[model samples]
Target chain A: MVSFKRYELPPLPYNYNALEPYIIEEIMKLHHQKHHNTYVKGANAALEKIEKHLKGEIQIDVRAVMRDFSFNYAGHIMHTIFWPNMAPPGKGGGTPGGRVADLIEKQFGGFEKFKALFSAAAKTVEGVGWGVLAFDPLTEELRILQVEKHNVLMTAGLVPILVIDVWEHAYYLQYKNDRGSYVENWWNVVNWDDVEKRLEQALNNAKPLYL
Target chain B: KRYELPPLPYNYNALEPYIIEEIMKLHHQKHHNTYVKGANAALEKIEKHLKGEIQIDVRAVMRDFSFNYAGHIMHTIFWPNMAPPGKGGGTPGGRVADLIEKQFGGFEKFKALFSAAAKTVEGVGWGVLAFDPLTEELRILQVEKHNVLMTAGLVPILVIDVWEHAYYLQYKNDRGSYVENWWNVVNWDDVEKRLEQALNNAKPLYLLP
Candidate 1:
């Protein structure tokens, strides 16, 4: 028998105050408990509605259903990657040492260049979104992408390895409107080990369907 | 600079029974025209900023540009992808038919997926059949509003407007029925022509070959 897996809000990898100063406690609490949880609940509800509709239990405005499904699903997927991508301030940051390090050096020339490009992508995002470091399966290369909202501007078949949320809600309380500084400070909390693990998994697991 | 709404390909009532006159009138004259005007206004603002005549949050201006530009592009394609009932809706012929079969199994399956994609948009937006130039494959995509969730290099060959303003006057909230009925008015010939142009001529604005 087939069963649908319900999406759940995963606990933060570290305490709310782990990335303090760079990312404050109040912001983490609200973002994880409120914003992230909303998407989890929304995705589950959408899936259930779709299931019921398919079983002939009821008719639905499918367009609305689909819209909810994509938005929530994207939000859930992105947030899942987000929580583990950072660590307690002292334990994180600095350059990575692994295949990911080699790939960054080869693809982006150096760590500093990658940082400059990625941060620029983050600071220039037109609206609420994330700055993503994604692995493009076709070229077997790394690329920086800017996503608008939870879903938008995604390059098909690219697997996200690292994501930094730049939504106003992510930094507004502490940073106010200084997104540039928020982006700069964010580098202090990146968990390189987690990013390397993600890159390894993506390389081994993700295969582009088209190519 | 100003953007002008292109005239509809047929009379307002030409698609009667499938798509009514009032819906067409409102969709073209009111809804689509707004996007044109919005896009033009955004462009003018960008020009002013570039010339140092104005200072604003450039990121916010860019967001406005994307929203309005996407709206304008999608609506422009939507107007021609339909025809009077008898003149449209049959198995597509030519390169489009071959591509549909190769990509989606057959026209029937393509219709099913397209309808599903159209009906599933969570908000006001569109269902698109686009050609991915990089892969030379056909893909069905769901667009939120005019801009969100878009694949960078895909060129739209066929589009169906799922926005409430596109069908709400006659269909009310029954977008499913509206989408189903929409099949009877699809301009397959226009779609075929678009597929040819996309495959041979279209260049994605940002992607470098």
Candidate 2:
């Protein structure tokens, strides 16, 4: 209720059409405005409900309600990564640089190998979910996780640096029913710089739990 | 009644501000209508079985009809039972207000308990304020997944659907907030009439109360 920074929709860094040909303007607007905004709103409500419970204003089935929180909160985090994880075609795609590249080389052997792994994870996800290249600060290692919101916390303690939205709404407007095609073409706008920055942040921000 | 789809009672946009038009539109046309169709389909099958025109499972069909029929009965009450901002909210009149005071001790108590009940359902369900024929009392109850009381002749007087689609798109995950704000749209006139009429009416539940 006070001046707290509640989750709000972060605007796209570029216009709806900025990604063009690859992501398209229509689904971009739909995803950011409709889907992402819904997640943001749900996240805020989830926080307020938990606050209400904490303050003794209401009694809830804590386990039942927290699922709502996890679903919305994780969705908000994933979508936040998703928007910046791609760039306006020219700036987004091609090879990585900086520490993220070095980590990719060390962890997965090569950039092409990591690309295949992440893309296959996205394409083969069991349901409407995300494929994330997440960093485990505890392990000082990288892991590719296929994340369904219900099972989201299975990747516990890992911080996602890059996410590919494998949900049908992410591409069905243009790519139709074939998810593999969307997964493949999404690379054309991959924001390696943004991924690199998040990797750095993860390395700096999270404490190594295992040590 | 043959479990037909009831009209939504107002324009789709009427409950806006508290609820959005798109949510209302799909809820009534899609969600509510599906319940009606399902109810009718099951009821008709039961009729056919009665005539020996078909051989099927009676128990399964009853469960199906009860699920859909309960959905039909409740949503029918749900729509007309709410009004737009100007005409709705405030408090109750008639015998219902007196009953609220007598039973729960006050309106706010009823609201808090009822809203909490709505917010805390295990999954998809409703927070129902109902008339208990056996005890001759007004009760705030939770009905889970369009079935059961969460047992009944418990006449549902006023209810709030906590099924996610009821408020998901509009209120998102905050059902507590939705229940609070839903008070604004409660057509108390409808509630008062339901309770006043219920006081004189009685029915047999499967429980024989």
Candidate 3:
């Protein structure tokens, strides 16, 4: 018999308003409950539906729905990291420190310049997408990337670190039309501390499981 | 139902002298909007076709829409990965730079290859730095349109869209200028970070995970 696992929304590391001003409470609430929740539920439903098909209990064709499920699960996994990757407002979070910062300075000239370049790439995306900071396993380096949509399979060889969701839903609630204001404000609530931790863990612990 | 077009990552004028306001407005509001609408329409149409209700093979139908919308989605994710001029571009550092030397003979060579590929795109496509997992070799591939049908075992590391739609308004017909301009805007820091992750994931153990 086949089985399915239930998908649940992971809790945010800080309170809804913790990253405030930069990331408003209203946006967090809607983002987590509505958007994130929708993805979780969709993932679970897809799992259960796929299980049924695996058990030969369902006669319906599921190739299309499975693709949707893959996208939903991808969203769930990435967002789980995104929510906690930030820190509460006024906490001096979102910037990299420790070994992470050292790596940044060593590889990219310095942290400040890195931030400027990353911000530019993230800001320049032409559509609903994300600016992703990912690590490459093959060459053992980091790269900043732009993903146009939700589930980017191209990321197979990269490990994501900092992800800025450019999807309008992430900011439209408060910033409305001004994307720059939102980007500027994001700095305050960034939780560099979290980013550093992810870096350390990724650098020290991350390694390929397959050849 | 249509998927709503998302807002830009920053203010219209934020890019300023680097990128003009008028271009930003039209790029985001007009170009991206069409993609969102197109993707949603294609998805709905493909979904309907998948029920055996439309006269097409399921895989073929999905392939058609997948190719069209993949670009839309990929571009959506690309914008926010960068920062404005002063804010930061997040260039690569440490092991990342070292590895770029090992893999591509250094950043300059990598840049040259990447730029060459980007400028040489025949039509609507992308210049991609990809890794062949099976061969464990890094390569530069120019891909036109979406869909991985041709890319069996490769994974994209960095990609620059060379489509006319990507630059015509700003660089006009000069693809070379656009490629050159992209270098100035590169987020090397983020690239370095991603390089590390890719390295880790490229390992046998990580790939399994």
Candidate 4:
């Protein structure tokens, strides 16, 4: 009862102010400290209750708990990747390189088309969530997913490598209702190095969805 | 190949109790058949427009074609996604079980996630277990409006249509109840076959040879 493990928010990779001009400092600071921290706490709280149920101290509704589990857990996963998904103005953005670039070209037709589709995926999400470029290990190809929330609509096995935070918290304060500019401007801060690292890790790992 | 209205693989009442004969009769004969006809009509005009035999608006016609055709395609997989009351539902087996375990923890969790997606799906459409050919993985997705693709390129393995006509007669208004009970008739064999064949071709859905 006294001993348990839980999630903690990692420090933002860069100063909250570093993403300025492109993504305002106010938003990044609030996002990491407030938004991302909330998910971490949400996940930890969910697991704590679920663990109590597991140990027979509490009888929780598995269904409801599972929903929170995903909402919070996937939320944590999203921000964990989202923070690292970008870089400051000088280090981020522009074009991709090496294997990630080649694969993006082949799968999405070209970098520009991929940009359009990825941005559109982020812009048009029916509700709050993310626009994801993920690695599909089965066919070893890249696929675009419009994640409607932290949890909903995710395929069981697609591993996200590059993600855009389309959640209003991701933009609104800076860009307003025109999510289009927010989606477009985000491209300027993409850390291709982190994307490449994520890609290589995904490439080396194959989590089969089918036997 | 041109789309056709596939015959129901079981008696209209075969999925009774969970899915009634009346609903099946209407769902299949009236609803699904309409989409088949809808798709067929759209395709003919597309050919006619392409052939320059008519002065039709191709873009508008093309839009209708996508909805009807995607509807047709969804139903095609749906009918076989369930089996007769006795032969279906229960523990999943074969590669489907393996994948479900690998990707989703286990069959129970898989059912929970699948049911949740179907229950919460925003509009009329389906809850699907599809084979993503790109990742060669099985994914759970919700297809809203049955319009175009949800995630294009992933082939459907199992689809439970949440369109009102699919369950309104038996479990009206409570989509959550319909989805929960619908599991009792899942055709694991058919799901497995869909996965096998989906992997056989380059981005081919389970429908084609």
Candidate 5:
């Protein structure tokens, strides 16, 4: 039986300086080493406690475990990607074009239109939540989503393509409450090539997770 | 450590033309500062109650404080995730096309659904595109406000903010135009990267818990 260890903090793909300017090196360091790592530790601890029971002959309280696991793991996984999604300014930061761009155009009448809708959804979030772009395998459609807190426990059977963390921790260090400015600078360090590849993988191999 | 309000990533005029300088200044200095103060106060109070230093209904206090500061903090994250149009397209290299094919049948279909979802949101809500780790699927979802407590098995990836505060300063009653103008300042590249990372690592995350 595989023993579940604590979730370790994964090293960033690029150096702290690589995503500089757009994402401060200090912020990345703290976010990855401190904030995200904390989630990893917490998630690991939660999973460790739950997995131990399953390995034994004891029947655990399925409901409680499920609830805790859902929220904790969600936080762990969300923060994992959340860290690398941003990069330094001028290092491939700009609008995405090609397939994703075409889709935005087709779905909303043009990329501008799709963004309009996306921005609206992002700004409307009431509290600590996330603004997301996801894929629904069942409907084979693309959608915009929001989540309160840190997890998406309510939305079942979808694949997240891109997301914006609306939590204060994500931007408070930089923008000082100017969310629009923070949102704007976010583009300076986006990794579009990675996103395209993920889209391909999601369509090819992600269906089973839902079924 | 206590979830205090952080500063903005870029200068106030970083997103010029698309988002005016005045808007940036007011939105950050005036609006976001207030949220920071509010969140700090709420968090301090909540910590006091959590430590049993004071006596109050834990659930009710937690809920209120969480909502108050979480909103403040969440917005703090939100501001930087977005960028000006043309200047901050999420997909600077045609990644959007790939996403369209992967999610919707084609790009056109994705646009239609996205537009409808944003335009049709009722009250102060958001239109989102999220992913489900258990099922490994993607979807377009509507958040009644900021939470997805009712929609099970989903993780949000991309979001569109439709609150009055987001557009009232510019579009007024014409939510449609506000939505339209917003496109001009989207950082599709950032969005695309976020999508990729989520697909690569964020998947296979929540399962059989």
Candidate 6:
């Protein structure tokens, strides 16, 4: 029998209202308690189905089960990263100063250019999706990626450093279709310390999968 | 740049009972054509932005381009994978049969797995049998929409579109019946040919040395 680990929803790094004005408290509550928890439940259910099929206990639909696995697992992982990626308004945002700062300037021309590119990605998702900043181990560079739903449009073997959920649920309650402003103001709660730590960990373990 | 929709290999009424004429006509003329147009527009916009002829969000354009491109490519394969019921289906011969027996134990087992995958798609997507050149194995993939949940570097050999438009007119909400009947029209010969071509043409896009 193939064993699987159950996924749990991680508690937010800070209180729900920690990043007020930029990200409203109500949105955070729903996004975490409802949205993130759903993924966790979905992923577990998918694994259980797969296990049943493996043991010949049931003839489950493999394709749908696998897709559920990918979508929910990706959702769980991305949301986990997102919580720590932000902080209380004053504690985060502004300009990052560290190894991450140097790399952003060197790779993307400057912080201003990177912000423009990332914000544009966040504002323009055709449907529910996310804007990601990933580290390409092969190219040794930072790349901006737009993901559709939780799993689409991803390049293999890239480690995500920062991500912003652009799904309507992320901001619709407060921003109310003004996605541009939401994307713009999201900078206020960015946790550079968290991002920097992620970057450091990514670089240390980075192994180029392809030449 | 533009993507022209490929002409369907058979007539609209070719796979009767399995897939009705109306479904085929709408699937090809309306659904497939839309993807072609969407992909072409996305490409044109990207080109214009690249040439500094227009100011656009490049990232958003790229996302749309991938979605449309994937849709177009999958539909192109789907068209050739069906034929008139009597002229298709049945046991495949030669290399494909050998591979099926070797990899999946037998054709029946492969069909069961493929059918299960097809029936289970969470939403509009495809159930695909693809060749993974890197591992020298065949894999069954559940593609979400046209692009999502794909295993990179796999070459698709056969595909079954489970999108509502592919069968909604004839099958209604009975996807199980639609999928069951679909096997009768599967052009195994075409699938075998695709497998041969993939083996000959395959090169790993990403491989670690």
- Give me the candidate number with maximum lDDT: 6
Clashing pairs in 6: none
lDDT by residue for model 1 over A124-205, one digit each (tens)?
A: 8877898888765445666566778877755344567789999999999999999999999999999998888777765653
- The full ranking of all candidates by lDDT, starting with the best, is 6, 1, 4, 2, 3, 5
Candidate achieving the largest TM-score: 6
DockQ of each model vs. true complex: 0.09, 0.01, 0.03, 0.06, 0.06, 0.10
Better of 1 and 2 by TM-score: 1
Each candidate: RMSD = 10.1, 21.7, 19.5, 9.1, 20.6, 9.5
lDDT of 6 at A96: 88
List runs of model 2 lying over 4 Å from the truth.
A1-4, A150-154, A208-211, B1-209
lDDT of 5 by residue, B1-209 (tens): 23345566567767665556676677777765675675456545544543447644433443444344334533543565567555564333355456555555455555555556676666865666665454344555455444332243354555666766666766678878766665666666556665565566544433211
| 3 versus 5: better lDDT goes to | 3
Model 4, runs deviating above 4 Å: A1-4, B1-209
Model 3 misplaced stretches (Cα beyond 4 Å): A60-62, B1-209
Q: Write the per-residue lDDT of candidate 1 for residues B102-167, one digit (tens) a residue.
A: 666577766876899898887887898876543465656689788777544456778899999888
For the predicted complex of model 6, DockQ is 0.10
Q: Write the per-residue lDDT of candidate 3 for residues A1-211, one digit (tens) a residue.
A: 2133365787887778877768788988899989999888886776566456434577533334444554665567567767766777656554666776776676555677567656665676567656666654434556555555556423444466677877788899899977767777776767666666656555654443211
Candidate 6 lDDT, A40-100, residue by residue in tens: 8997788677656655689876766777876886788778778888999887789888978
Tens digits of lDDT, candidate 2, A158-192: 45678888888999999999999999899989998
Pairs that clash in candidate 4: A138-B135, A138-B136, A139-B135, A139-B136
Model 1, C-alpha of B123: deviation from truth (Å): 12
> Cα lDDT for residue B142, model 6?
84
lDDT of 2 by residue, B166-208 (tens): 9989788998888888888998888877766555542221112
Worst 10 residues of 6 chain A by lDDT: A202-211
Top DockQ model: 6
